[PDB]
Design a binder for this molecule. Structure first.
Ligand SMILES: *[C@@H]1O[C@H](CO)[C@H](O)[C@H](O)[C@H]1O
Ligand SMILES: *[C@@H]1O[C@H](CO)[C@H](O)[C@H](O)[C@H]1O
Lengths: 5, 5
């Protein structure tokens, strides 16, 4: 999965 | 923050 910060 | 699964 991937996350934006 | 938000994550794509
Ligand atoms: C997340 O955003 C970037 C641009 O910041 C890019 O379009 C990636 O493909 C996306 O997953
Ligand atoms: C994550 O992706 C969705 C896809 O429908 C949408 O562009 C949201 O604005 C983005 O944050």
């Amino acid at each position: 999965y991937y996350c934006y910060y």
